[PDB]
Structures are given as structure tokens and as C-alpha cells.
Amino acid sequence: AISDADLKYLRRCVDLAREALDDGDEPFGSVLVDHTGTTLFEDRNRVKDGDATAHPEFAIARWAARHLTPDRRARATVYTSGEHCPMCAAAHAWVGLGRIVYATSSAQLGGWLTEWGAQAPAVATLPINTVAPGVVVDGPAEELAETMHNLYRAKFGR
Amino acid sequence: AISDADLKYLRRCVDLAREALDDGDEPFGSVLVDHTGTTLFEDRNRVKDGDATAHPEFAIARWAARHLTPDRRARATVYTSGEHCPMCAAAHAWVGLGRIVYATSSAQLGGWLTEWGAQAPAVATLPINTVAPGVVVDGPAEELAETMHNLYRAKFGR
Ligand SMILES: [Zn+2]
Ligand SMILES: [Zn+2]
């Protein structure tokens, strides 16, 4: 279900995750793309100033609610380097956004954390469709698994 | 599990939910209380302006992260008229807030919504601990069930 065009946007997400890591934040990047294929909004994690809710997917949900009609929201796609946490999946569904494509699943992330002896997140790694049963979800992208493993290990595996 | 002091705060949450209803918003109210019993912050639903994520528990999580140290957050309690949705439960856990007490469960509300035929929510009515395993949760408060049913009927009855 991941197309060539989808993978290009996922690579952009990975670049945004890398920007976040390099700035002292956590490696999570996300991009909102409308049905015409225009990038509307890009963001990355910004938790370093002490708000652990500063996730890019959440920013995208609020931005979409403020700037896009319901119909435009439903036809838009959200690309992300890492599958929406429950906070972000719920926000996405509350505002009525459409498709999600992720590079790595929360299952991947949680599995790596336990491999590395790292503490589990404070929030359960629920798949998007546990939280938001109606959302169309594609991913993960096999081509990006190694990159994201390495990027998460840098932040969370030390 | 629910003291008389807890009920006082839950009754304040009901008052805030009614304030929301009367202002054209949905009937959800929430209070943040310091471990020393002082109210720190109170809020209610503000969705009418077009943002379905304007939940008071979420506003509380962000307020807490901005204004309180981690230690003070861990020791604070959040009271709410309606059990946190997954968005809010996750945000509460991310910012490391403490106990939650709710007047009515999301299962209770979901059952009543179905009776009224109403559009089922896009977000699943997961219990807080499915989303946030480590959070201490108490509720519901049987003495406030009928009051809250009536408030919900006012907004969502058909
Ligand atoms: Zn998130
Ligand atoms: Zn909520």
C-alpha cells in the first residue's frame, strides 16, 4: 500500500526527525499533504522545552482544524516517521483528517525499546486503529526500518 | 475510592460542564488540584469555535507542563465530569500528572449516545488505563450518574 510517491514523503518525515534530533528534540517528523499533492504543513517534535505533548501530528491536527474545511481534511494525507501515539491518533480522528502513512509502527518502536533495555513510554503503544477505528492506515515502510532503528537508538537506546 | 472531598471537586466539574452547555459548548468540565488541596486551574469544553480537540483535560495537561515542575505534576490530581478520551488520557500521562477521578465513565456516555441514536464517535471509548497503564484512576461516582445523564441528554439527546 506504500507507493513511490508515499515513500518520498516518508523520507521527508525522516529528514524532519533528524532535524529534531540535531536540535535536541526527539526524532519524530510529520507532513500534511492535500489531495492535489501539495504539502500544506510540516513539523517535528519539540518536547525539549518541557512539554512532552509537543508532537508534530498533534500540531497538524490543530492546524488542519483551523485552516481546512472538513472536506479538505478528509481528503488530506498525514505522513509520519513514526506511527501516531494515542494522543495524536485521537486528535487526528477528532478533527476528521484522512489517511495516515507511517514509516515505522509503534510495534517496531516498542520492540526496539525492550531490546535496548529502555523504559516503556508512559503511554501504551496502541495501533492507530485501536484508537481511531475508521482511519485508513498504511505502513510501515521496509526501506526505512534500518534508518529509524538507528535514529531511535541514538535518542532512546543509550 | 471516592472521598467526600473528591465529590466536592467532581460537583465543581459538573458546574463547569453546565457552564459549557449554557455557552453552546459540550458538557465536559475538569479541575486540576495541587497535592496541598489548592485548585490550580479549571476548564471546560470549548469546541464550538470549530476545534473538536478543545477538551479541558488536554488544556490542563498543557497548563501543567507550562506552569508546574514534574514533582508538582506527579502529586496533582485531575477531576473530570467525563472520563478522559484517549487524546486526553495520553496527554495526562505524557506530562506525568497524577491521579484521575471521574464522575461518569466513557462507557456510560457511549451507552447513552447509542440509546439516542447519535453519531458514534470517531475515537474509541477506551478506558484510561488502556491508554495510560500507570495512571491511578478512580470513578465513576454513582451519586452523580443521573445528573450527568441529564446534562448529556441536554446536548446529545434526540
Ligand atoms: Zn503523539
Ligand atoms: Zn479528551
UniProtKB/TrEMBL annotation, chains A, B:
Xref: CDD domains: nucleoside_deaminase
> Where would I find the CMP/dCMP-type deaminase domain in this sequence?
4-113
Question: Where on the tree of life does the source sit, at the highest rank?
Answer: Bacteria
Question: InterPro entries in the record, alphabetically?
Answer: CMP_dCMP_dom, Cytidine_deaminase-like
Pfam family membership, one: dCMP_cyt_deam_1
Gene Ontology MF annotations: catalytic activity
| This protein's name | CMP/dCMP deaminase, zinc-binding protein
Which organism was this protein described from?
A: Mycolicibacterium smegmatis (strain ATCC 700084 / mc(2)155)
Q: What is the lineage of its organism?
A: Bacteria, Bacillati, Actinomycetota, Actinomycetes, Mycobacteriales
